[PDB]
């Protein structure tokens, strides 16, 4: 019978996932392809251990798709996953963690997809939140983290052509390497500040700003889902009164994300088998790649891109982000815990507070 080998790699998760033994030879939601899911749990959590582990695994076993989750703030994992996907022409889904943090510079040949919001979609949500409370005067601070230009250009885009009273005061670009930063942050006027950067960079940028008094009352910082990250890990240096977009497993838990990864890869193999009477072979080397099986791969990609499952639209954009994620807006409260203050689902923002709290 027709069957696709899928690997599920969970990395540093307290969260527990249980999947049918592959030996069951059991169909998955009536799809014509039968998944052979290999669960792999990882004790180790550094990028090097992960490439070593995933590559060893493609060499040793017959894998044609990879579902990957991690519980860390290590965006670097997304770089590794992209490379591997490109090298092997295998679909790789980054369903949670550092693996799903926005990666702007994806190889156009990789079939690496991330769950959650594109960089633009988050820029858009950030402006939605600000309009819902007539926060119209604001500044942007970014680092050099890839995506930063796509961030600003999306703000400037939606702002320049609209008859709302938007006013972009300053736009900063920070160099994280050495304190000539202090002099740049000191130049910040506006009460709303949009910050694009990494969790790591954020925690240092805050500490500096905390000590220029651009934190606290009268200043609101809005930040992208990667800066929140693992919401159980809150840097001492993050200011209470911090708003962030987020996708850190509030309503959509790991087992549901894994179920969904399997469905995407398995629907795609099914739809392709339907039309072309065949399915891409397993590639077995991240490195020594005789891999000019390029025509086949490209074909799969048309299908991964458009999957729909249990009524959910799981389709992906060209840049490799999820088209329609259901996001949560969160707030860093006085007890220094992240708190739900909103929701978003197909251009519909539902905020929780009537008057914005004082934190
Ligand atoms: C993919 O999306 C298009 C356009 O919205 C749709 O019409 C098409 O039938 C989809 N394919 C599947 C298998 O749903
Ligand atoms: C695997 O994880 C740790 C540290 O990475 C290791 O040292 C340890 O021996 C392993 N887990 C257990 C329960 O021993
Ligand atoms: Cl391991
Ligand atoms: Cl981490
Ligand atoms: Cl996520
Ligand atoms: Cl993100
Ligand atoms: Cl984008
Ligand atoms: Cl950029
Ligand atoms: Cl730019
Ligand atoms: Cl700088
Ligand atoms: Cl501090
Ligand atoms: Cl969620
Ligand atoms: Cl579930
Ligand atoms: Cl299921
Ligand atoms: Cl190899
Ligand atoms: Cl082509
Ligand atoms: Cl509180
Ligand atoms: Cl909450
Ligand atoms: Cl709400
Ligand atoms: Na994401």
Swiss-Prot record:
It is found in: Cell membrane; Postsynaptic cell membrane; Late endosome; Lysosome. Phosphorylated on tyrosine residues. Glycans are attached at residues 43, 306, 313. Residues 1-359 are extracellular. Changing residue 324 to A: Normal zinc binding. Changing residue 96 to A: Reduced zinc binding. Zn(2+) binds at residues 96, 249. Expressed in the hippocampus including the dentate gyrus (at protein level). Detected in adult olfactory bulb, brain cortex, hippocampus, striatum, thalamus, superior colliculus, with much lower levels in inferior colliculus, midbrain and cerebellum. Disulfide bonds join 55-286. Component of N-methyl-D-aspartate (NMDA) receptors (NMDARs) that function as heterotetrameric, ligand-gated cation channels with high calcium permeability and voltage-dependent block by Mg(2+). Participates in synaptic plasticity for learning and memory formation by contributing to the long-term depression (LTD) of hippocampus membrane currents. Channel activation requires binding of the neurotransmitter L-glutamate to the GluN2 subunit, glycine or D-serine binding to the GluN1 subunit, plus membrane depolarization to eliminate channel inhibition by Mg(2+). Belongs to the glutamate-gated ion channel (TC 1.A.10.1) family. NR2B/GRIN2B subfamily. The extracellular N-terminal domain (ATD/NTD) endows NMDARs with a unique capacity for allosteric modulation, harboring several binding sites for small molecule ligands that act as subunit-specific allosteric modulators of ion channel activity. Heterotetramer. Forms heterotetrameric channels composed of two GluN1/zeta subunits (GRIN1), and two identical GluN2/epsilon subunits (GRIN2A, GRIN2B, GRIN2C or GRIN2D) or GluN3 subunits (GRIN3A or GRIN3B) (in vitro). Can also form heterotetrameric channels that contain at least two GluN1 subunits and at least two different GluN2 subunits (or a combination of one GluN2 and one GluN3 subunits) (in vitro). In vivo, the subunit composition may depend on the expression levels of the different subunits. Found in a complex with GRIN1, GRIN3A and PPP2CB. Found in a complex with GRIN1 and GRIN3B. This is Glutamate receptor ionotropic, NMDA 2B. It comes from Rattus norvegicus (Rat). The lineage of its organism: Eukaryota, Metazoa, Chordata, Craniata, Vertebrata.
């Amino acid at each position: 019978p027709p069957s696709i080998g899928i690997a599920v790699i969970l990395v540093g998760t307290s969260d527990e996932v249980a999947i049918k033994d592959a030996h069951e030879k059991d169909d998955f939601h009536h799809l014509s392809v039968v998944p052979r899911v290999e669960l792999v749990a990882m004790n180790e959590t550094d990028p090097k251990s992960i490439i070593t582990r995933i590559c060893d695994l493609m060499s040793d076993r017959k894998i044609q798709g990879v579902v990957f989750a991690d519980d860390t703030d290590q965006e670097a994992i997304a770089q590794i996953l992209d490379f591997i996907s490109a090298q092997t022409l295998t679909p790789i889904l980054g369903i949670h963690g550092g693996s799903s943090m926005i990666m702007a510079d994806k190889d156009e040949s990789s079939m690496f997809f991330q769950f959650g919001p594109s960089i633009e979609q988050q820029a858009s949500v950030m402006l939605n939140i600000m309009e819902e409370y007539d926060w119209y005067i604001f500044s942007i601070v970014t680092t050099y983290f890839p995506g930063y230009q796509d961030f600003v250009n999306k703000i400037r885009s939606t702002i320049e052509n609209s008859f709302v009273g938007w006013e972009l005061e300053e736009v900063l670009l920070l160099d994280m390497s050495l304190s000539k930063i202090q002099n740049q942050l000191k130049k910040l006027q506006s009460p709303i500040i949009l910050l694009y950067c990494t969790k790591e960079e954020a925690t240092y940028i805050f500490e500096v700003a905390n000590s220029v008094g651009l934190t606290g009352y009268g200043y609101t910082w809005i930040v992208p889902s990667l800066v929140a990250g693992d919401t159980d890990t809150v840097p001492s240096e993050f200011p209470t009164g911090l708003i962030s977009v987020s996708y850190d497993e509030w309503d959509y838990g790991l087992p549901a994300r894994v179920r969904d990864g399997i469905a995407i890869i398995t629907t795609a193999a099914s739809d392709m088998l339907s039309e072309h009477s065949f399915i891409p072979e397993p590639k077995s080397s991240c490195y020594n790649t005789h891999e000019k099986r390029i025509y086949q791969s490209n074909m799969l990609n048309r299908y991964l891109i458009n999957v729909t499952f249990e009524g959910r639209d799981l389709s992906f954009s060209e840049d490799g982000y999820q088209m329609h994620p259901k996001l949560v807006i969160i707030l860093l409260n006085k007890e220094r815990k992240w708190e739900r203050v909103g929701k978003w689902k197909d251009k519909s923002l539902q905020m929780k507070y009537y008057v914005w709290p004082r934190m």
